[PDB]
Design a protein around this ligand. Structure first.
Ligand code: 1C4
Ligand code: 1C4
Ligand code: 1C4
Ligand code: 1C4
Lengths: 424, 424, 424, 424
């Protein structure tokens, strides 16, 4: 397409990404060669697009090569690496080489880059009988110092190294560190830059999007490498991060493509908090009634007698929290086998605005999809826009199922009519 | 002495040092061993005393050992080192090791420490036929980014490395870099931390204090090592820095002793700008007259006829700038061979407050010292405090030379009498 | 010792004191003579060390002398003074004299000093039948205006005077005022500057440190003078202040010695909040189990069957809040009569970080000290550092009691071994 | 009038006064009695109207009464008072009493009030043979600390007391101090609050407005009391202050009446900088030409041949600076003896905007007033608004002098016509 078509395509993603915080976990293989130069170009750019960036890099792969080649053999317990005083020594050397290459890569294509003593570490200790030695975990993250720099527009660079109150230095696992830091910053996005195109489903495909549950179900049959990833991503998500993404840092431009296109190569994981939605039974009726009466009192909902409710209960779904009822919604069917109706959609004013609306709308869309329903209607006097903004086209009365066009004319309400098409 | 006697001793030096900027050039030998731990302790402390700190470290000595040992031979032109792509490589490694050791040393005895891409470098190029290669000089110092961090209370750490617009990295001479950076920050103090107790005079003594002239006169007969130091110190001073100091980083506590004691081990260099002070001759008389008439008009100065001036001209010193007369002062002598008087001390209101007063007072103190004068008097109606604050004790009339006690009683002025003792 | 030994000694105390707020209650006797000049020197210094200072002074002793001498007799009810319109009058005069002397004392050895209308007062009213008249208490403290000035680095000076909405002025008791103000600022330190070396124990010794309980037990048999002190200190502590201290303002340098030495002359009082720690009995077992199972599930704790627990319950201490169990810890004994072991140390993740750990560690240290135990061991896989940072030296297996060295080899865990020596 | 008529009257004065700085020199007699309460009410109000307030008070009158009554006799040299250690002592007492009364007066009718060590003083020394002793002058004003508090909205209170580097305290003359401080703050207004209705002209009237010249001409025949006032006011004005005012603090509401009414009781002094305006002669013609040609080139001015200029030179006034010509303007006369015209009004673009326009307009208004001219016309194509905003009503051609109505129709320009009536 044209340049102008591409920029207008990314525009909405720039608007979202702007002022948000993005923490990037970089495999250290990427920080060597023609790949490092392009990584800095796109990162440079992100800075320019006003995204607050935190960058941590890995070292395991360097170390592990320095080892084998120089005689010794690296050893890993429960995923984590044993790092001896000498591994630690060269981990510090590597960090100074990578920070410096990157810095140069960034001036070769202004942008301001900062590092500090932001991380304090304790030793992992002993795992399954094995002393890990200089393997550490982040004990304290200087979250104020971080935000202070990000506020200033500076790119934050972090080696896989934190220090202890005792004057020792520890080697940190990039993947767990990226996740920790991100959760401290309550960052909106954690991005792991790997050498893989993402996380594959069992059928060898690339899982474009995943839930933290779907992801967790993939880990059982998965390489231990991507097992630890998933666990850190799932940990991040639970800890606050809005979205974590896995990309191939070796795929030229992938970072730009992931962030500013609709489709975006690579895989993204998010956690949709659990809300309990279930078929209504005889007992919710007093609750549902309690919820909808005020509404039908205001003339927003059509009146629904307890009796009606008693013999129409199966059309109803209720959304609950701790046995409390906070929402409901009904799917109506018709002679026309394609049509459905979302009816009696209500969330209590106190639990409003938390996304419950959406969740009941979705829920009955799956119900309606299960029974071969393609067109789904919604009539309302004072809430049509909500539907407009969620996949609905205003409709005409002559386009309703016959029975509903007839209630429509008797009503005397003139509610607005909106339809949405449900797909295969 | 007691703890309380020591703290009260340092108190005035803390008051001066506070909020001022101090740039420290560290020999990299200091960043290894039990010496690094104590360096960080005292630096940690300085941070706590509210001194803005910038820290750059050297690498030549590491490199040069890595070289010889590993076969190769280092080479230096006009003081500067030839650093090849491989020297550069390990200079980056060293920097990552030293920054990290220091960081740990600082947590083992909270304090916030920051580094950035503050320096942009160009290659030195070719010197006397020799390609220097990866030897660079600071082309641009990010002075805003620096001040921004110092304002935040952060300690700034800088490796001897800056980058180019071309994506290359260059090795910087710590000593020249420290001086450049300091001059950009217009820092009040540059401190070089060496392995020597300072700069020795020809007589093998340690030159406690020096002027940028005295220092420059020492460089001719001096080791090339301390030659480059002096030139960087003298360059700093000319460029703005108020004071540069040379200490032995290996002398435990020297840094604290230099900054917060009266005497302070090690050597300090400062530049006193040039002001021309000379004996008056026949021609200054209209100028001097012009200067002092307003004053004697106000009754601050005793009246001095042109005639008086004509046959007393040799008592007079004048302070001038571009042939312009901005001050004057007279030394009076007496039957009493010990006594002098500072008389007719005046600086034009326009050039007042720049220290001219001081300079004429000093000047005639050297005159008065040259002719065996120990007690120096000063009488005035409205300016006695100035003298109080500069080494003067209020005196009684019965303590003046006889002739002056007699003018004193006739006068009818009752001017205040202050004396100051001049020494061997 | 050397200057350098003294500065490095105070360094940790400067680091703590920095940015913290210190409110000083000054007996007004100190504000007269050679003692006032040194008080300002050390206060000047504190300002320079970045401590936020609030200074309130007393007046009772002046007033009371002005009285008797000028005929009249002062009278005090429940500790507080009756101040009549004329006492009030001269209390305002004194305040203007003391503020001004201090100000001068501070310029004679830059530092910025501010006073305002920060205090609004109501009358105390009538006490035990007696009209107190112009005796007031602080009704409102302008806490925002205060912080605003302290933020600016200014020293805050406050007379023992506050005003009313009615346009009257009241005399405030310095001691209660200092405590009130401090509690408003939630200051980390309240310091009373008296004419006494502190608070004496019954045996005529100077109580170096006290708890707000120990202190309160001293007040019964104590001079009414120090009774009111204690009550204000205890009130401050309960109200938020971290530490209150009593010094002799007439003891030259005491203020510097109190704040920046380990030992520090004078007496300090602090409140350790109450946490209930008691021997475990049969009933805690399900709770303790609940607490430690997750841990032994993670392999952090060795497994402890309910049965074990049932016949080892007396080794156990539990830490509780409102009948809730939040921690536990066991002392193990051995054939070796000198040895103990802290075992099964656990605090629930929810009440973690509040210092509960410390409190159980301490607690069993007192238990272990009670039964002649000098060496106390602690083995763990993932928490050795905690012990390092609390008085523990890493140990070797060959140094455990025999039985424990044997479990150690069977275990197959290789936990880290740390010891700490308990004293007489 | 009505409340609404009064508020709308003051509105323009509130708009001017807002955000401006006002320094008030208060006679200390005002700070006692029912007069102090009302002074604080109106000052309180000023604070509320967003005027930055600095308040210094006097003490001479208190002292001088304390003296005589208690035996001793006060003595003054060149206006300034001899203040001995004991005068100084009670000057500090008075200051503490007045600050405190005022503070209370201000709470009896929220508003934030601050004092500090803002003033550093040196002794005046000896005057005409007399030791002044504790008479001081402000040597340094902490101008940053002041602005910092004013920025915060705080009312600044200053006693007539400043300190020395030597730890001494000096008595300051309120009147000279107010003027100094004001000039440091470059305050827009200095206000002296006296016990007099202002400064009287020789004819015993109250001089409503004065120039710093008119004022200075009144001082020769004036009481020494008001002599020193005038000199301080004139000194303030020269030093930057836009306006200084003298009021009677004992006249209830005078302060409000002075600041927020058109007329305002009491007397105000301002300095109109000197600009040289004189009749043109033969020599300015090339200059005037140079000035107006560009303009008549643009068609803003009617063309005026050198010849015209040569025989019309007496109609011309020129405004000059250092022999440079920066403006000109011509007064035209007519058969109609009442009419004038401002013609050929021009200021060079470089010296534009400095008020030169105004000054030439005024100047020829005085010329035109001198020769019996009441109506003054001004025609222009592109600058009519300037005249509208300076006392001019748009006019019709039929209202011009006949000759000018005739040039008007030939012109073919249709310039705008504005008139202004000049009075007796
Ligand atoms: C609209 C409801 C369901 C959204 O709940 P909830 O807040 O949990 O969902 P949500 O968090 O996903 O959406 C929140 C956002 O929607 C927006 N929103 C809320 N009410 C809106 C409205 N009336 N118009 C536009 N936007 C609205 C909010 O501004 C909020 O904005 P944001 O995205 O944060 O910028 C909730 O406000 C509610 O229960 N309102 C009262 C009930 C109601 O209006 N029901 C009508 C549904 S249409 C179908 C229906 O029930 N019809 C009737 C009869 C009508 C007839 O036939 O004439 C019947 O069946 O009996
Ligand atoms: C005092 C003079 C010399 C200082 O010049 P200059 O400003 O260049 O020196 P400086 O920069 O080193 O000092 C500046 C500082 O001194 C301070 N200062 C200036 N005048 C001061 C004063 N009168 N009192 C206290 N401090 C003063 C300034 O505040 C400034 O303060 P800072 O340190 O920045 O905080 C200058 O202000 C001046 O020329 N004043 C007028 C002349 C004058 O007062 N001469 C008296 C000298 S005593 C000897 C003398 O000439 N006596 C008479 C007769 C007297 C008799 O016998 O009765 C005679 O021989 O004829
Ligand atoms: C470590 C515990 C006790 C501290 O509780 P609590 O937080 O209330 O105490 P606290 O507030 O005084 O200390 C908090 C500070 O300690 C630090 N901290 C917490 N865990 C740490 C760790 N693993 N390493 C270093 N520092 C740690 C925190 O960072 C915090 O830092 P801060 O001072 O605020 O900068 C708590 O985290 C906990 O219960 N962790 C899980 C239990 C555990 O690790 N127990 C091991 C104790 S060693 C003895 C033991 O029970 N051994 C086993 C078997 C072992 C074997 O023989 O192989 C047995 O007897 O069965
Ligand atoms: C308008 C002149 C005189 C003001 O000089 P100056 O800047 O020194 O005075 P000022 O500082 O007191 O006033 C400055 C303020 O006036 C405002 N101002 C300047 N030009 C303005 C304009 N054309 N309209 C409205 N306001 C204007 C400025 O905005 C400034 O605003 P501020 O108060 O700071 O917010 C100056 O801009 C100038 O020389 N302009 C070019 C000459 C010009 O326009 N002369 C016309 C005067 S009317 C009389 C005249 O000379 N007529 C012709 C023929 C016309 C005919 O008969 O058709 C003749 O006799 O040959």
């Amino acid at each position: 397409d044209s340049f102008v078509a591409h920029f207008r395509e990314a525009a909405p993603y720039i608007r979202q990404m702007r002022g948000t915080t993005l923490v990037a976990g970089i495999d250290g293989r990427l920080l060597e060669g023609g790949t490092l130069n392009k990584l800095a170009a796109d990162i440079g750019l992100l800075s320019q697009l006003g995204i607050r960036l935190v960058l941590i890099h890995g070292a395991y792969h360097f170390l592990d090569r320095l080892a084998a080649a120089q005689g010794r053999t690296p050893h890993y317990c429960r995923g984590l690496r044993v790092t001896d005083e000498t591994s630690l020594g060269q981990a510090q050397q590597f960090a100074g080489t990578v920070r410096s290459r990157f810095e140069a890569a960034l001036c070769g294509s202004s942008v301001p880059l900062v590092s500090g003593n932001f991380l304090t570490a304790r030793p992992i200790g002993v795992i399954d009988g094995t002393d890990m030695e200089y393997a550490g975990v982040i004990r304290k993250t200087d979250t104020a110092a971080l935000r202070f720099q990000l506020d200033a527009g500076n790119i934050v660079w972090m080696p896989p190294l934190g220090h202890s109150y005792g004057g020792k230095t520890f080697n940190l696992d990039m993947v767990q560190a990226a996740a920790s830091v991100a959760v401290s910053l309550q960052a909106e996005k954690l991005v792991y830059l790997t050498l893989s195109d993402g996380i594959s489903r069992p059928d060898g495909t690339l899982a474009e999007t995943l839930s933290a549950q779907e992801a967790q179900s993939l880990a059982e049959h998965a390489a231990s490498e991507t097992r630890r990833l998933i666990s850190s991503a799932v940990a991040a998500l639970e800890g606050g991060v809005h979205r974590v993404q896995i990309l191939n840092g070796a795929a030229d431009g992938s970072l730009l493509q992931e962030l500013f296109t609709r489709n975006g190569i690579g895989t993204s994981i998010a956690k949709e908090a659990f809300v309990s939605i279930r078929q209504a039974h005889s007992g919710d009726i007093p609750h549902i009634a309690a919820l909808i009466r005020p509404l039908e009192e205001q003339g927003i909902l059509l009146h629904r007698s307890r009796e009606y409710l008693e013999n129409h209960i199966s059309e109803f779904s209720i959304l609950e929290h701790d046995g409390n009822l906070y929402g409901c919604a009904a799917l109506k069917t018709f002679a026309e086998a394609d049509c459905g109706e979302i009816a009696c959609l209500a969330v209590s004013p106190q639990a409003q605005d938390g996304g419950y609306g959406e969740r009941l709308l979705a829920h009955i869309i799956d119900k309606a999809r299960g029974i071969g329903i393609s067109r789904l209607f919604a009539l309302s006097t004072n809430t049509g826009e909500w539907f407009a903004e969620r996949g609905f086209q205003t409709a005409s009365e002559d386009e309703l199922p016959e029975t509903r066009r007839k209630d429509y004319r008797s009503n005397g309400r003139n509610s607005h009519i909106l339809v949405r098409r449900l797909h295969r």
